[PDB]
Design an enzyme around this catalytic site. Structure first.
Site, mmCIF file in Angstrom:
data_model
loop_
_atom_site.group_PDB
_atom_site.id
_atom_site.type_symbol
_atom_site.label_atom_id
_atom_site.label_comp_id
_atom_site.label_asym_id
_atom_site.label_seq_id
_atom_site.Cartn_x
_atom_site.Cartn_y
_atom_site.Cartn_z
ATOM 1 N NE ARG A 63 109.328 24.062 -19.122
ATOM 2 C CZ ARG A 63 109.583 23.635 -20.351
ATOM 3 N NH1 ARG A 63 110.816 23.363 -20.747
ATOM 4 N NH2 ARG A 63 108.576 23.474 -21.204
ATOM 5 C CG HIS B 288 110.537 15.905 -29.849
ATOM 6 N ND1 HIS B 288 109.936 16.858 -30.644
ATOM 7 C CD2 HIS B 288 110.676 16.469 -28.625
ATOM 8 C CE1 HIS B 288 109.723 17.951 -29.933
ATOM 9 N NE2 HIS B 288 110.163 17.741 -28.704
ATOM 10 C CD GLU C 140 102.987 17.133 -30.876
ATOM 11 O OE1 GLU C 140 103.422 17.788 -31.845
ATOM 12 O OE2 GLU C 140 103.023 17.552 -29.700
ATOM 13 C CD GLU D 101 102.525 23.265 -27.777
ATOM 14 O OE1 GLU D 101 103.130 23.709 -28.776
ATOM 15 O OE2 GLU D 101 102.564 22.064 -27.437
ATOM 16 C CG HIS E 18 113.408 27.033 -23.699
ATOM 17 N ND1 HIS E 18 113.568 26.314 -22.534
ATOM 18 C CD2 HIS E 18 112.324 26.509 -24.319
ATOM 19 C CE1 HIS E 18 112.618 25.400 -22.449
ATOM 20 N NE2 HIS E 18 111.850 25.497 -23.519
#
Lengths: 597, 50
Positions: free
Chosen positions: A255, A327, A357, A384, A487
């Site tokens: 990825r 996280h 964030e 996002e 995922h």
């Protein structure tokens, strides 16, 4: 009075109850994240049970309302967001089996441990052990061993669980009026009843395929350059025309290729853009990061930010007695309550992550005035992208120079721009072909397109075509390598990353166009542009109250999915890669494999 | 949550200038109108302030 009026009253009551219930659940969640204790887990159990019971009750109470009789667009959207029952559409036993399979699969993925054959007591998990170890250490044998062990001790166990999970997720989707669970997940992007904006679920697949084939030349040139750099590094381990190994990409799934940046740096002598030294010298902190970020948002026209977030949220490490999750997370707890899960140290990666964030938080209370159901992003990619665009804008050297983090004497030469562009490509488009490959494979698995006794093989085969990456050693159908990712193993859609990358590129291009930016797209700073900020907030305040295609058309002017902003961003890098690949073959060959002599 | 303070949620009609809505008027919250029937689709008239 009428059934629609009764539905409106029911939705109002549901919103009133769910706001309080979700606020309490989110408060308990923040307490548990900031304090991992047994009583915290107890209130997770309590809040989850309460929220699930209320959600199912309200789903049924919306279900008995016929969705056809409601004509208000907002009421229809809220009801269809509530009328869904998920796995409960099946029998209770089938739903329980699916939930147990999901829990077991997530546990196996999270607890996936591999032990060295020469040391049985030396066992390491996937994270942070295996991934960091093979991303830092470039040993071919160690990376291959870790990759094979991780995909063996997990994939072999997960294959029957995955086959159950898949069909089970499918049967609910089926009963939920969907050809497969892939269609069930694609129904999020589905738009109905809107003239000029209605979206079909397969249209997402077709747009993703069109964008992938648009970026195909750039991806092939990047693959050729990576192969050339690996030839400079490990000439004997890869064929000049054969596909790259799956364990020589920075991660077992391939990825993220950013770990190969050291091996694929264009100009190693040229320093990377990093003001962490000045960040320490200026004696700033995460609070100063937030202050500079708020000043930047003031420059783009965003309003001031409430002190309640400052008091409730944490920006540095809260010691160790109050154990907290590091996280990155943004929390819209409801009723004007917002929080951030960060451990931002005096660095730049944590700086950009905290920026992202906080931008997620900004998108969150941008649409706070929307109802409880509509207090969310339009799709799974818009959320996002809002953080991504402003993080990219703040990461530009112009913003750093303006805020004083970067000295004004810093110069932007061709080599530094090329290094930055290649780093951005490895971070962004190093997974877009992989995102499309895995989502289509998952789509295929749910739509049953791929064949079981051939699934993995078929995977590897188009791993040689879509990704141009071949497995170092063969994996039988007992292997379930795609399920080794979070995922797939935790029932999460994967196309969200591709969609969010496309949306972030489109939004950044639109913001630069509105800000009248002059110069390369990668050097575009949206600072001191209130008009662009207002235009962005126009969509941000809507949330999911309007079709996501409508929001895209309002912001960037294009309703259909496209990578034209990506092409504009990577055009200098595309030309640079084309020039560099004059000697290295562009593309890949599916015939060669590292396990073939 | 200071539940001592509550806000009226069930109210069939509107209000008049300076009207004491102490009466716990009940209106439907689901699908079936109350119409004097308690239980389903008839929750508490007012909700506490959390």
């Amino acid at each position: 009075s009428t059934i629609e009026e009764q539905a409106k009253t029911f939705l109002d009551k549901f919103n009133h109850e769910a706001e309080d219930l979700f606020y309490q659940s989110s408060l308990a969640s923040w307490n548990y994240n900031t304090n991992i204790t047994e009583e915290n887990v107890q209130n997770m159990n309590n809040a989850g049970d309460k929220w699930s019971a209320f959600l199912k009750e309200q789903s049924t109470l919306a279900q008995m309302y016929p969705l056809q009789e409601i004509q208000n667009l907002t009421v229809k959207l809220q009801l269809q967001a509530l009328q869904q029952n998920g796995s409960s559409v099946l029998s209770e036993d089938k739903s329980k089996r699916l939930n147990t399979i999901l829990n077991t699969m997530s546990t196996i993925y999270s607890t996936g441990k591999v032990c060295n054959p020469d040391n049985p007591q030396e066992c390491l998990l996937l994270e942070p052990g295996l991934n960091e170890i093979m991303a830092n250490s470039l040993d071919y044998n160690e990376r291959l061993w870790a990759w094979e062990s991780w995909r063996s001790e997990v994939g072999k166990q997960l294959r029957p669980l995955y086959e159950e999970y898949v069909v089970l997720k499918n049967e609910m989707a089926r009963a939920n009026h969907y050809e497969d669970y892939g269609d069930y997940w694609r129904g999020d992007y589905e738009v109905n009843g809107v003239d000029g904006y209605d979206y079909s679920r397969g249209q997402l697949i077709e747009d993703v395929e069109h964008t992938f084939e648009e970026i195909k030349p750039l991806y092939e040139h990047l693959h050729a350059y990576v192969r050339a750099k690996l030839m400079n590094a490990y000439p004997s381990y890869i064929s000049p025309i054969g596909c790259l190994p799956a364990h020589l990409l920075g991660d077992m799934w391939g990825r993220f290729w950013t770990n190969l940046y050291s091996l694929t740096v264009p100009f190693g002598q040229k320093p990377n853009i990093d003001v962490t030294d000045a960040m320490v010298d200026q004696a700033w902190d995460a609070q100063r990061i937030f202050k500079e970020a708020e000043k930047f948002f003031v420059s783009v026209g965003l309003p001031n930010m409430t002190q309640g977030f400052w008091e409730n949220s944490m920006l540095t490490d809260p010691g160790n007695v109050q154990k907290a999750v590091c996280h990155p997370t943004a929390w819209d707890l409801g009723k004007g309550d917002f929080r951030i899960l960060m451990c931002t140290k005096v660095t730049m990666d944590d700086f950009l992550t905290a920026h992202h964030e906080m931008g997620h938080i900004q998108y969150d209370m941008a649409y706070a005035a929307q109802p409880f159901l509509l207090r969310n992003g339009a799709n799974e990619g818009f959320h996002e992208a809002v953080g991504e665009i402003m993080s990219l804008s703040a990461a530009t050297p112009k913003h750093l120079k303006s805020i004083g983090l970067l000295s004004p004497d810093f110069q932007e030469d061709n080599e530094t721009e090329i290094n930055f562009l290649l780093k951005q490509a490895l971070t962004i488009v190093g997974t877009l072909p992989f995102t499309y490959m895995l989502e289509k494979w998952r789509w295929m698995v749910f739509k049953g397109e791929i064949p079981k006794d051939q699934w993995m093989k078929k995977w590897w085969e188009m791993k040689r075509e879509i990704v141009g990456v071949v497995e170092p050693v063969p994996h039988d159908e007992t292997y379930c390598d795609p399920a080794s990712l979070f995922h797939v193993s935790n029932d999460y859609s994967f196309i969200r990353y591709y969609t969010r990358t496309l949306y972030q590129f489109q939004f950044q291009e639109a913001l630069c166009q509105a800000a009248k930016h002059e110069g390369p797209l990668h050097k575009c700073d949206i600072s001191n542009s209130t008009e662009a900020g207002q235009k962005l907030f126009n969509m941000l305040r809507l949330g999911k109250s309007e079709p996501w295609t409508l929001a895209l058309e309002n912001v960037v002017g294009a309703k259909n999915m496209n990578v034209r902003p990506l092409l504009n961003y990577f055009e200098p890098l595309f030309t640079w890669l084309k020039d560099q690949n004059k000697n290295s073959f562009v593309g890949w060959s599916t015939d060669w494999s590292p396990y073939a002599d | 949550g200071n539940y001592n303070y509550l806000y009226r949620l069930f109210r069939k009609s509107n209000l008049k200038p300076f009207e004491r809505d102490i009466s716990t008027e009940i209106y439907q919250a689901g699908s079936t109108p109350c119409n004097g029937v308690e239980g389903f689709n008839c929750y508490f008239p007012l909700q506490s302030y959390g």
